[PDB]
Ligand binder design. Structure first.
Ligand SMILES: [Fe+2]
Ligand SMILES: [Fe+2]
Ligand SMILES: [Fe+2]
Ligand SMILES: [Fe+2]
Ligand SMILES: [Fe+2]
Ligand SMILES: [Fe+2]
Lengths: 248, 244, 247, 244, 245, 244
């Protein structure tokens, strides 16, 4: 039986899986665009980004509730022109609800970071940061086995900054999305031998090389979508509601 | 005519660089400025009911004196959702001239200064806000003009007696903050503006500045009506007012 | 009827309205004064430490001047004009000036409680986290609420009738200036009717959009109501001549 | 020649007041600038491996494009300790020209502009960073030049089709921040720079700005080689490159 | 008799208020009516309590001080500041200050020092106009002797290096010996004459080889303030006394 | 002994979490802490001449009371260059216990308190800085103690007469800021500290607080000598003093 749900029921279910208070300070989570949460929902769409093409695709596929991992806006605005105008207009004239679980989806049990920790079967995993982001533990295997898993399940040509030789049973840190800032490299260099994340840039590569931290950039997109598919299939398994993905 | 032409006409009258630092002037809501405009609506406030009225009257371009938002947001729920939904669904352009319309020649403050026929008028503040000059008449005559053209029942804080030919300061809108009262007490005998509150009243009494609160609304709408008729004289376009 | 030392008056007042109830940054306590052993024959109560109030205190032989509002919110480092004239009257007459501001707003039976008890609010709770204001159910009609306002607070209150109000509605009260834009947004989530003072245009417009009915009974009157209660509380307990200056 | 003479030559080419606000340009590590210099080393980064190589090759004056530290410190441990110790015990001078070398005439951004032979080039930002102008040719010809001279396999974010004689913006190093994307989208059809990340890619696609990431390293090293060759041509001094 | 506002325009002609550095609390400290007639003007370095007590005792009407009454703003009046204001207000004594505008102006406190040492072709030491620097045409010992004879009998000398004749001398009246000041002046001079030396600044001067002479905050200012006092006495028909010097 | 063992011993005496907020305590300069230590040097200040003397005397672990840098830097030239070059090329560890050594039991302030035999001593400030208590004797006896054990000719600001059995506050180093004078005036009759300047002197006189400046150096070196003898008594290690 596939059935219609009210928006508020979907939201309460998502927030049971990924409570809002797990979100780190200042993260723009929750209702992005919407008014009435009693709205009946026929079709739930899941996306990584609330991009313009995702929102156009939501309109085309008759999506009533659009879930995105990333918030619509990180920085507040007071004028509505260009792209943000095009996006809000499509959402508002179609009364499409836009809702986000961001770092709360990263941090929660079986969330985006746990999905990575489980894929690599990390021994005794711990949160990588104090705020609960990322996971770290021992990878029980060779660097090459880790690489093959990375290539088979996450991304084919990952960038490897092979700063040093890596022995079997090494400490592996994972962080879905963008974990490769300079300050993150410095912090993680103390906690792990290998750091798997996304969005490598030049100064961070150089730093990783100086510190002997092996960094694997399997992209921002892929390291999050892996967990986001698990999330989608979790929702499909529990809600009798048509659910589609839009940018994955 | 097209929206960008209405906008260039307004910005010729009241240039954007006249706005004080940080004022959210210009385009509030809109994308295509080549859009043809049949009906222009003028409002003091971009309130929910004003926006509902614009939609109802087939307004294509909504001009307001106050910006839609002072403080930036990153979620769209409740009232702002309702306002944006009406504007966006109908492609109604929302555009504002705020302090640039206060400050410019023949703008809202010049309108008050001209109503009272101020002798040798000067900007009240360095940034160009407000006007001050001599009111060539008695206090009571100043009051009669106020009641006849701006507001029938102004609040008068009669901190001292006012002799004929006094210095009168005007500031359309909200000019009655505590720091304004202190500043204007040095420059004028009588201060005509809006939105008086308790502490500013006490302060004016202490300083001996006579303050006349003819309301925020009326002291702006007077000049805003002049602006509307100016637009009507120059633009071949249906132009209506929505909250005045 | 007898004379008291200033510090005895201060201790009685701070027993009623403890300083630690004051919100962050509030300039409460001693405003102007040195020696607190000074004997006090006449205590004067005022809402504002205005220039005319201070002149009246001098004229009536007030030794201890209590005001609800602090003399200064913003600190200064030059003493001219009005503040010069005021300090000179206080110092030349050695008049002690002391204030209870938000600690008097927040304390039990203080300015906000006075309003809550006046409207007989059912199960009142603090309106804001810092303890400012009160909110609860008004057991009656909107009309009965307005009459109480007109009978006890202010004759012609401004009413922003943003929506219809049914009997037994949620009423929020806040003595003084509670009508800022951010207050309207916050209180709109908590009550049907908001009674406070000092309404200005943008707040009025905002209240209308949110459906919050706003009643402006003025800054002065919504505080003086409780300030009269305070004055009577002092008179019942202190053997001392006590007058009011701006009410 | 003395270190101060090398410094004066570089600063004549790329004056320090051209550096943007807060940029840590000039002398990074050094004391005596009267010291005579036998071997000058040029590097993009003052990395630990670059500094070690400098010692091994007997470099006494080490020039880098990037400053040693952006953020100030007050403790000396770990990597920064190893770097300072090698520089200090060997009295190797470390000197940087950063954004002043990006902005100056024939500096890193001009070199890109000249490579693409931009028609009527202007600075991309007000502060002088980047260049923008017309590429007199097809997008494919533009790609071919990029592949031959800068990076064999650039990432192309093909947000839209690009017509011949399009507007090309170049910015050596990292010019692909989100605010940079939004800004450059109004000035150019194609944005050539380095260090593309996910949110910026998405933004570029939404805006129709075609972005070509030829890497941070390669888009700087191209001009840094021209700078090296200019030094070699004018200074009677051994000059080597260390990380390129 | 002359009015208070006339004394103020006279002082401000000598030392214009726009010369004061950003944020300096110069001008009218305590007072209302400036049409007030003034019989007796008192000059002081500090508006201290005892200076203000002395002002009342001597019938001073206009109290001029180099230092402002308050640097940091207040919003309560108790203890010492209550006592100072009470004396000024019940006696209607006007309190007025010229602070850095008096340090910086032509023939002001820093120029007074520069002239004492006959500095060859002097320039302002800081961009904002504070201090003076130039060549002292003589030996270090001759410089010390002038210091001992005219400013302070026994200055603290931090002798960080030997000093050759015809050296560069920087002077700054009052407190010029902060750590950031030592670093700055070390680039500009061989010898630094000022007041209020403390331990970290002393160490820093030794490291940089900057010779520092602390002839005290008080003396390096009172020297010029006496010249200022005689300047007023020569031009104003008015009884003028000094209170803490 | 290894460097880390010396550090663990010092931190047992003066725990790092006792330091006031932001105080730059701990490792200033050093990399390898398993290093065995040949000679420990103690200094008040990590000055240039102190560090030179350490090199000359073969000190490999240099302890100072004052941190090397309070304000972080990002360029390394002049004096700081000369200092780091010596520490780094000789691999000399530089470590500081600053306010944690001021506050800890038998630390610098306790040493003063015990010297004057303060009756029933308390911390002067909430954060644990300084000590205050009753001096069981005359002002003159206090002065005689000050002259014999701390500094001959201390500067005395004799703001009022001092009766026997007065309250004495002590603070090793710089305790004579204006806000400290105001604070201590409420708590003691006499304030013993260092680094007096003019405005503080005037302020003390206004408040009637008697202030004795026995100098920054000496009021700390007294306790620092006790600390040195404590280390010498407990560690099988050569220990010398460098600036005292
Ligand atoms: Fe992400
Ligand atoms: Fe307005
Ligand atoms: Fe109030
Ligand atoms: Fe770069
Ligand atoms: Fe001074
Ligand atoms: Fe110290």
């Amino acid at each position: 039986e596939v059935v219609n749900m009210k928006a508020k029921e979907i939201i309460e279910f998502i927030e049971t899986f990924a409570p809002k208070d797990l979100a780190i300070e200042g993260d723009n989570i929750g209702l992005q665009v919407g008014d009435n949460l009693d709205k009946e929902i026929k079709k739930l769409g899941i996306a990584l980004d609330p991009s313009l093409s995702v929102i156009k695709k939501a309109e085309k596929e008759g999506v009533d509730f659009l879930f995105t991992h990333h918030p619509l806006l990180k920085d507040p605005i007071r004028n509505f022109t260009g792209v943000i105008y095009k996006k809000l207009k499509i959402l508002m004239e179609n009364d499409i609800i836009l809702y986000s679980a961001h770092t709360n989806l990263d941090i929660c049990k079986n969330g985006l970071n746990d999905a990575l920790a489980e894929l690599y079967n990390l021994e005794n995993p711990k949160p990588l940061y104090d705020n609960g982001l990322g996971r770290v533990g021992i990878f029980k295997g060779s660097f090459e086995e880790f690489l093959e898993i990375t290539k088979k399940y996450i991304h084919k040509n990952p960038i490897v900054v092979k700063s040093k030789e890596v022995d079997d049973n090494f400490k592996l840190a994972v962080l879905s999305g963008y974990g490769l800032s300079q300050s993150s490299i410095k912090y993680v260099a103390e906690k792990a031998d290998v750091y798997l994340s996304g969005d490598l840039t030049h100064h961070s590569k150089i730093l990783a090389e100086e510190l002997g931290l092996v960094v694997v950039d399997a992209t921002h997109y892929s390291t999050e979508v892996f967990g986001l598919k698990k999330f989608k299939e979790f929702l499909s398994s529990n809600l009798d509601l048509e659910i589609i993905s839009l940018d994955f």
